[PDB]
Amino acid sequence: LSPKQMKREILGVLIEKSMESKVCKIYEPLLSINLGPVLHLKFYETFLAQLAEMAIITLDSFTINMTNLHNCYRYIITRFQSLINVQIPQITIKYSEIRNFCKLPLLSKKLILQMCKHFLNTTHIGNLIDWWVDPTSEERYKVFFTYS
């Protein structure tokens, strides 16, 4: 598990916790990851602060508020569900689009791509069977879809 790979792990858990409820206890992601020490506290705390610095979550003494995370991931679901049902081969998206639509200017490219990959890795709906994400421009990425 590289540090990037671990960050994506935490992010994935947060994404799923946020679809269940917009707040959870700060230790819960740490708890579940250390059962599926695998994850040291200092690393976890640091990554949380970085997501808070991008305003996609906010941290309290005992809770993670994931409102923006839930909202932004809902946009991605809605956007990508809508692409699968038209069965588009490929699409090109500006990082600025997710940022503007969600009103989250500080979202990084890395975070945006990891949320999109989390959705495609997790979606069941549609005749989708393969996908690929290609970060092309500094302002754009492309997604390729496969239908059966």
Resolution (Å) of this entry: 2.6
3-state secondary structure the chain: CCHHHHHHHHHHHHHHHHHHCCEEECHHHHHHHCCCCCCCHHHHHHHHHHHHHCCCCEECCCEEECHHHHHHHHHHHHHHHHHHHHCCCEEEEEHHHHHHHHCCCCCCHHHHHHHHHHHHHHCCCCCEEEEEEEECCCCEEEEEEEEC
Sign of the CA dihedral running 10, 111, 88, 74 = positive
Method of structure determination: X-ray
Q: Does domain 71-148 have CATH number 3.30.1370.230?
A: yes
CB 113 within 8 A of CB 133: yes
Sign of the CA dihedral running 136, 72, 12, 106 = positive
Identity at 79, one-letter amino acid code: R
